[PDB]
Design a protein around this ligand. Structure first.
Ligand SMILES: COc1cc2c(cc1-c1c(C)noc1C)ncc1[nH]c(=O)n([C@H](C)c3ccccn3)c12
Length: 116
């Protein structure tokens, strides 16, 4: 499982993506999509690997991420799911783009090398 420096970097990115500073557009991505409560019963027709920021946060703190690439895959899945179910021009599509660009910016400074 991921080492200390890489884990603390990942915690910082995930904490930043979930911060209340960004609550006006990260809120739909804090918890898993509930198609029954949200009245979109065809969500799982389009999304086969659901993911949310809270799930990524728990997997990280649960020592489930072997490396930073695995975390990037999961976080990318949040937005791939969003754009797959929500067409261009919808609110949550715009919010997903806003949050994903923040993620790309923070992730650009990820450690590239490991040193046990
Ligand atoms: C309108 O889309 C959502 C709205 C949500 C949501 C998750 C989604 C969502 C996500 C994320 N991916 O697909 C869907 C559908 N999760 C919680 C939540 N609480 C909540 O009030 N909403 C409403 C309906 C909403 C509508 C448009 C933009 C932002 N939020 C939502």
């Amino acid at each position: 499982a991921m080492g200390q420096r890489a884990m603390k970097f990942c915690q910082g990115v995930v904490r930043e993506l979930m911060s209340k500073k960004y609550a006006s557009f990260n809120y739909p991505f804090l918890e898993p999509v509930d198609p029954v409560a949200l009245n979109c019963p065809t969500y799982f027709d389009y999304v086969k690997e659901p993911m949310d920021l809270g799930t990524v946060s728990k997997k990280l703190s649960n020592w489930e991420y072997e490396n930073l690439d695995q975390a990037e895959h999961d976080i990318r899945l949040i937005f791939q799911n969003c754009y797959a179910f929500n067409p261009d021009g919808t609110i949550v599509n715009m919010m997903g783009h806003r949050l994903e660009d923040i993620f790309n910016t923070k992730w650009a400074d990820r450690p590239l090398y490991s040193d046990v």
